[PDB]
C-alpha cells in the first residue's frame, strides 16, 4: 500500500494566522501533472468532509511525495482532525491525521464538585463527580484528596474536544468508592494543577454538612 | 440536497455478521459508486472498499481477508455492507460515502452518511443508573451522573434539549463491560432552583428513558 504520514501530530494556531500540516506518501501520487491526494476534515462527533481533490481558506500544495494542507486565516470553527488521502492506487489509503487546536488566551477552570446522590447511595455506591470547564490550555492535571490523603484507584476521566465556538476544553472527573469507604471518611477534595494559577484550584465538601 | 442515511448502531457478538445500510437520496444513486471506510479510533480511517452501483463490480481492500461483502437494492437507492466472523478489532465506525469527482479523474468521497457504529462483544444489554448532581445552598453548575450502561450510545438532554448552551456532555468510559458518563450545565445563579432543570436520558439499546429533575439539596 501507499503509507501517508503527517506532520504534525497536533498543532495550535492563533486566529487569522496560518497553519500548515504535511502529507508524505511513502511513493509518488502523481501522474500526468494530476496529484491524486485529497484533504479531509474531521470535527468530533461528525463524519469526515471533503475539503480539497488534487493541486478558498484552505489550499492543497504539493508534487511527487510531498503535499501539505494550509489553512488561512484560520477560524475557530476550524478545530478539527484533517486527513490526506491518496487516490493513486487501490487500496486507497489515508494520513494519521494531524488535530488542529486553536490558541486562544488562557483561561482558568470553572471546578465544581458534586457529593454522591442519596439514589446511588441506596444502592451501595459512591461516586464523587469532579468538573473542570472552560479552561485553556489543554494540559491539566486532577488529584483526588480524601482526608487529605491522595486517593487514586476509583478515579476515571473523562475530557472534551476543543470547543468550536470559545476554543475552551473542559474535563471530568470521577472518584468511585463504596458507600462503606465514603461514609468513613469526611472531606473529599478535587484538587487541580493548571498553567493559569500557581497554586492549584481546590473544591472540597465535608459528607457531614 | 444529496444525503446518505445509514443504519443504527449494532451490538453484535464475537463470530456472527452484520449487515449495514446506507440509503442515498438527493441524487442518481446508481450514478455514483459508493466507499465503505472503517473508523475505530479518531486518528484512524481506513478503506474497505469500492461498490459499483451500477455494475455491480467491488474492489476490495485486501486487509479484510474477503470478511466484506458488498451488495445494493437499485429500486430502493440502498447499498449493503456485511461483515462476518466479528471481533473486537472490528468495533468501530462504518461509513458509506460517495464517489465523486470534483477534479477530473481523481477519486474523491464526497458527500459521507453519518456513520453506523458497531460494537463487538459478548456483553450484556444493561439500562443506566441515572443520578443527579445538585449543588449545597453568578452562574451555577449542574450534574448528571449516567452510569452502569451497555451498549452506547446513550444521549443526554437538558429541560427536553431547551437548555443546551453551557451543556458539557462528557464521553464515556467503558470499565468491567459497562460505561459512565456525565454531563454539566451551566445556568445563571437567579434561574435554579427557582426555576427546574431537568436531565433526560435515553439508551435506546435497553429501551430506556429516565428524567431526573435536579432537586435542591434538603
Known amino acids: 500500500d501507499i503509507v501517508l504520514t503527517q506532520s504534525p501530530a497536533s498543532l495550535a494556531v492563533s486566529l487569522g494566522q496560518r497553519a500548515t500540516i504535511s502529507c508524505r506518501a511513502s511513493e509518488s501520487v502523481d501522474n500526468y501533472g494530476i496529484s491524486f491526494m485529497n484533504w479531509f476534515q474531521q470535527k468530533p462527533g461528525q463524519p469526515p468532509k471533503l475539503l480539497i481533490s488534487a493541486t478558498a481558506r484552505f489550499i492543497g500544495s504539493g508534487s511527487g511525495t510531498d503535499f501539505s494542507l494550509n489553512i488561512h486565516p484560520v477560524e475557530e470553527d476550524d478545530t478539527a482532525m484533517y486527513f490526506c488521502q491518496q487516490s493513486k492506487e487501490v487500496p486507497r489509503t489515508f494520513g494519521g491525521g494531524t488535530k488542529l487546536e486553536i490558541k486562544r488566551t488562557d483561561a482558568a477552570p470553572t471546578v465544581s464538585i458534586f457529593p454522591p446522590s442519596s439514589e446511588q447511595l441506596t444502592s451501595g455506591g459512591a461516586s464523587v463527580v469532579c468538573f473542570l470547564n472552560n479552561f485553556y490550555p489543554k494540559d491539566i492535571n486532577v488529584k483526588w484528596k480524601i482526608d487529605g490523603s491522595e486517593r487514586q484507584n476509583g478515579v476515571l476521566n473523562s475530557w472534551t474536544d476543543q470547543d468550536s465556538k470559545d476554543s475552551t476544553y473542559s474535563m471530568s472527573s470521577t472518584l468511585t468508592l463504596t458507600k462503606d469507604e465514603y461514609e468513613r471518611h469526611n472531606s473529599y477534595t478535587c484538587e487541580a494543577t493548571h498553567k493559569t494559577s500557581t497554586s492549584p484550584i481546590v473544591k472540597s465538601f465535608n459528607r457531614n454538612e | 440536497q444529496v444525503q446518505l442515511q445509514q443504519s443504527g448502531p449494532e451490538l453484535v457478538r464475537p463470530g456472527v455478521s452484520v449487515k449495514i445500510s446506507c440509503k442515498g437520496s438527493?441524487?442518481?444513486?446508481?450514478?455514483?459508486?459508493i466507499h465503505w471506510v472503517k473508523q475505530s479510533h479518531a486518528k484512524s480511517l481506513e478503506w474497505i472498499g469500492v461498490f459499483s452501483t451500477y455494475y455491480g463490480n467491488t474492489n476490495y481492500n485486501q486487509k479484510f481477508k474477503g470478511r466484506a461483502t458488498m451488495t445494493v437494492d437499485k429500486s430502493s437507492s440502498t447499498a449493503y455492507m456485511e461483515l462476518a466472523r466479528l471481533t473486537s478489532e472490528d468495533s468501530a465506525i462504518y461509513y458509506c460515502?460517495?464517489?465523486?469527482?470534483?477534479?477530473?479523474?481523481?477519486?474523491?468521497?464526497?458527500?459521507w452518511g453519518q456513520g453506523t457504529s458497531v460494537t463487538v462483544s459478548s456483553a450484556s444489554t444493561t439500562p443506566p443508573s441515572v443520578y443527579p448532581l445538585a449543588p449545597g445552598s453568578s452562574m451555577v453548575t449542574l450534574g448528571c451522573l449516567v452510569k452502569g450502561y451497555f451498549p452506547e450510545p446513550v444521549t443526554v438532554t437538558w429541560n427536553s434539549g431547551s437548555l443546551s448552551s453551557g451543556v458539557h456532555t462528557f464521553p464515556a468510559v467503558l470499565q468491567s463491560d459497562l460505561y459512565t458518563l456525565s454531563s454539566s450545565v451551566t445556568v445563571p445563579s437567579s434561574t435554579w432552583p427557582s426555576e427546574t432543570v431537568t436531565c433526560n436520558v435515553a439508551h435506546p439499546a435497553s429501551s430506556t428513558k429516565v428524567d431526573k429533575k435536579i432537586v435542591p439539596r434538603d
Open positions: 438527493g441524487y442518481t444513486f446508481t450514478d455514483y459508486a
Open positions: 460515502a460517495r464517489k465523486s469527482y470534483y477534479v477530473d479523474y481523481v477519486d474523491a468521497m464526497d458527500y
